[PDB]
Amino acid sequence: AFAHFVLIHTICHGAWIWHKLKPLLEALGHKVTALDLAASGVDPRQIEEIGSFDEYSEPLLTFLEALPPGEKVILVGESCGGLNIAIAADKYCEKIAAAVFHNSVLPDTEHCPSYVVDKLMEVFPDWKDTTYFTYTKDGKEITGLKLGFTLLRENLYTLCGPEEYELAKMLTRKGSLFQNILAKRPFFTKEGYGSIKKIYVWTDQDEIFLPEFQLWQIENYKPDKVYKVEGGDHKLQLTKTKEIAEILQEVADTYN
Amino acid sequence: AFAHFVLIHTICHGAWIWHKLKPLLEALGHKVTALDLAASGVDPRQIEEIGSFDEYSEPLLTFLEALPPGEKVILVGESCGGLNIAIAADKYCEKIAAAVFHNSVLPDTEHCPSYVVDKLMEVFPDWKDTTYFTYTKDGKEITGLKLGFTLLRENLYTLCGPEEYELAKMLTRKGSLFQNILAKRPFFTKEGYGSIKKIYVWTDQDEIFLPEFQLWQIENYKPDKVYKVEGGDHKLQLTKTKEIAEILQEVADTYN
C-alpha cells in the first residue's frame, strides 16, 4: 500500500536531513512531505522569535490543519522530533494513521513533557563543542544552542559520508530544546497523543541517544512495535536509508 | 601548493551546492570557505531586502575585507557567481590570486554589467516552470524568481543523483538576477576586475548555459586559461567533483 509520510527533522536541522530518504520513499510510490519547522532549514524566522516547542511546531500543525477530512498521514520524527509528534497528536490525532520514532525521544502521558529530555541530559550531559546562549521571549529565559562541529562529526553523523557531514556544518542553525518551557507545559493527553499507534525505530550504535536512554524509553512507554536497525549511527536516514524505507513500507502496510 | 579557495554559489542557491567539493579540496590540503550570499542558503535576510547584485554580494565583500594584509584567495564562482567575482574584484583585486569561473557568466569591462546576462536570456529565454514576482527596493522595481522544479531537474541538475536534486528542491530560495539594476550599474573597471587572472571552466553538456553562450563569452573576453570538462552537467561540482578539484589544484599551483 501507499501512504503519505510527513518527515519531521530535529532541532537545529531542517527538511534537508531527509534528502536521501524522501526520493527513496517516492520510488516506492509514496507521497512524502518534508517540512522545515519554525526557524529551521530555510524557514524565514530566527530562533529568538520562538518561545516554545509548540510554537516551534507551527509548520507541522499548519500542515495537518490543511489536510482535507479523511486524509491521514504517517508522521516520522527523528531525534527530538518525537516532541513535535506528541504536540501535533494532541491537536490532530484523527489525521494520524501512526507515528514512527527514528532514534527519537518518546514522550509519555504520565510525566511532564520534559521528562524524557531531562533523562537524555542525564545520560548525555556533555555536548562537547556545542555553544549556548540565552534570549527572552514572552517573559521566559530560553537557552539556545548551536551544535558543535566536533559533536556533529563524532556523535551525530558518526558514520556518515564527508559530503553529508559537510551539509550539517553548512546548514545546521541555532535552535533550542525549550527544556524549561516543556517542564511547565501541560501534560500530553491520553485521548490525543496517547491514542495513536507508535512505532519505535533505533540502532544500538547511536552515539548520542545511547542504548541506556533508548532502552529506557521503550520500557517507560511501551511502543506498539519496535524495529532495531543493525549498524549505522544517529542519522539512520543517511547511513541506513534503505533499511528505514523498508521499515516505513511495512508500517504503511500495517497502519492506515 | 595549498591555496585558500572561496566558493561562491549562484542565485537561488547557497553554500550547500559545494557540499561535495569542499571536503575534497580540504583532502588535498586546501583551506576552503563556502559562503552564503545575502538572502541565500541560511542567511537571515529575505530577497525583498536586497536591491542590487552589489548588496547581494555583501557576505563576499565582508569576507574579503576581513582578510589580513598579504593574504590572497582564489575565488570560484558558479553560474551567476561570476558577477559577484567582478564586483568583489573592483574592491579587493589585491587580495585575489585568481578567479575561476565554473559554468559561469563572464562579465567584461567594455560593455555594461548586464551585457552577458542579456545575452544569456537571448540564448535561453524559456525557464520553464520558473515563477516570477516583483518587489520594490530603493525606488526600483526588481524582478524576483523561484527556480521551477522541472527546470532544476532537466536543465540545471540534469545528470545529478536524486539525492542531490532533492537538496535543490528543498533548499533553493527566491532570488533575483537584478538585471535592470545591472544595466544601470557603472562598468566593471580595467584596473580592478580587469587586472585579475581568470580561469574559465565549462562543459559543452551544460543544458542551460549552452555551448553557444559559453563559447560566445570566451571569444568576447579572452580568459587567461580555459578548461573544458567532458560530460557532466551545469552542476559540475556535483557531477564532476573530482575533475573540478584536479583543475583547482592546478590553478593553486599556477597562480598565487
Distance CA B90, CA B107 (A): 12
> Side chain identity at A92, as an amino acid letter?
Y
Nearest to A104, CA basis, from A246, A7, A231, A242: A7
Please calculate the CA angle A183-A188-A193 and round it to the nearest 5 degrees. Answer: 145
Largest CA distance in chain A: 48
Nearest by CB to residue B23, choosing from A19, A46, A166, is A166
> In whole angstroms, how large is the CA radius of gyration of chain A?
17
Distance CA A64, CA A73 (A): 9
Q: What are phi and psi of B140, to 5 degrees?
A: -120, 140
Distance CA A251, CA A59 (A): 24
- Determine whether B168 is exposed, middle or buried from the number of CB atoms within 10 Å of its CB (0-12, 13-18, 19+): buried
Strand-strand pairing, A198-202 and B96-102: unpaired
Tell the residue number behind the cell numbers 477530512, with chain if given. A69
Please tell me the class of the A1-256 domain.
alpha beta
Question: CA nearest B26 in A: which residue?
Answer: A162
Strand-strand pairing, A131-137 and A140-146: antiparallel
Q: Which helix (H) or strand (E) holds B241?
A: helix B241-254
Distance CA B122, CA B116 (A): 10
Give strand ranges (E) for A116-177. 131-137, 140-146, 175-176
Please calculate the CA angle B7-A36-A38 and round it to the nearest 5 degrees. Answer: 110
The reply to whether residue A16 touches residue B167, judged by beta carbons under 8 angstroms, is yes
- Determine whether B237 is exposed, middle or buried from the number of CB atoms within 10 Å of its CB (0-12, 13-18, 19+): buried
Method used to solve the structure: X-ray
Cell numbers of A113, please? 513533557
Nearest to A62, CA basis, from A91, A94, A93, A104: A91
Bridge partners of residue B5, in order along the sequence: B32, B74
Distance CA A131, CA A148 (A): 7
Q: What are phi and psi of B77, to 5 degrees?
A: -115, 135
Distance CA A184, CA A53 (A): 12
Asked whether the CA dihedral A160, A164, A167, A169 is positive or negative, the reply is: positive
Nearest by CB to residue A170, choosing from B19, B27, B163, is B19
Question: CA nearest A171 in B: which residue?
Answer: B42
DSSP A189: P
Distance CA A5, CA B242 (A): 35
Nearest by CB to residue A16, choosing from B27, B46, B170, is B170
Question: CA nearest B241 in A: which residue?
Answer: A163
Distance CA B173, CA B168 (A): 9
The reply to whether residue B19 touches residue A173, judged by beta carbons under 8 angstroms, is no
> In whole angstroms, how large is the CA radius of gyration of chain B?
17
Tell the residue number behind the cell numbers 576581513, with chain if given. B66
Strand-strand pairing, B96-102 and B73-78: parallel
Nearest to A86, CA basis, from A103, A65, A63, A109: A109
Cell numbers of B131, please? 515563477
The 10 Å Cβ neighbour count of residue B233 is 21
Q: What are phi and psi of B146, to 5 degrees?
A: -130, 115
Tell the residue number behind the cell numbers 520553464, with chain if given. B128
Measured in whole angstroms, how far is the alpha carbon of residue A120 from the centre of its chain?
14
DSSP B50: -
Nearest by CB to residue B34, choosing from A15, A163, A170, is A170
| DSSP string of B23-49, one letter each residue | HHHHTTT-EEEE---TTSTT-S--GGG
Cell numbers of A108, please? 509519555
Residues A211, A204 contacting (CB under 8 angstroms): yes
Cell numbers of A234, please? 544517529
A16 to chain B, closest Cα gap in Å: 6
Distance CA B104, CA B108 (A): 13
SS3 (DSSP) at A142? strand
The reply to whether residue A46 touches residue B42, judged by beta carbons under 8 angstroms, is no
Exactly one of A40, A57, A79, A114 is catalytic; name it: A79
Distance CA B55, CA B67 (A): 19
Which positions ≥6 away from A240 have C-beta within 8 Å? A203, A229, A231, A232
Question: What stretches of A48-114 show up as alpha helix (H) in DSSP?
Answer: 53-56, 58-65, 81-92
Q: What are phi and psi of A154, to 5 degrees?
A: -90, -35
- Determine whether B191 is exposed, middle or buried from the number of CB atoms within 10 Å of its CB (0-12, 13-18, 19+): exposed
The reply to whether residue A167 touches residue B14, judged by beta carbons under 8 angstroms, is no
The reply to whether residue A16 touches residue B42, judged by beta carbons under 8 angstroms, is no
SS3 (DSSP) at A144? strand
Is A57 known to be catalytic?
Answer: no
Residues B18, B30 contacting (CB under 8 angstroms): no
Please calculate the CA angle A68-A69-A73 and round it to the nearest 5 degrees. Answer: 75
DSSP B187: P
Residues B108, B220 contacting (CB under 8 angstroms): yes
The 10 Å Cβ neighbour count of residue A183 is 13
DSSP B70: T
Distance CA A197, CA A8 (A): 17
What CA–CA distances, in Å, run from B81 to A2, B6, B169?
Answer: 42, 11, 20
Q: Within the 41-80 window of chain A, which residues sit less than 8 Å (CB to CB) from chain B?
A: 41-42, 44, 46
Nearest to B163, CA basis, from A233, A165, A18: A18
Looking at the complex, does the CB of residue B166 fall below 8 Å from at least one CB of chain A? yes
Looking at the complex, does the CB of residue B23 fall below 8 Å from at least one CB of chain A? yes
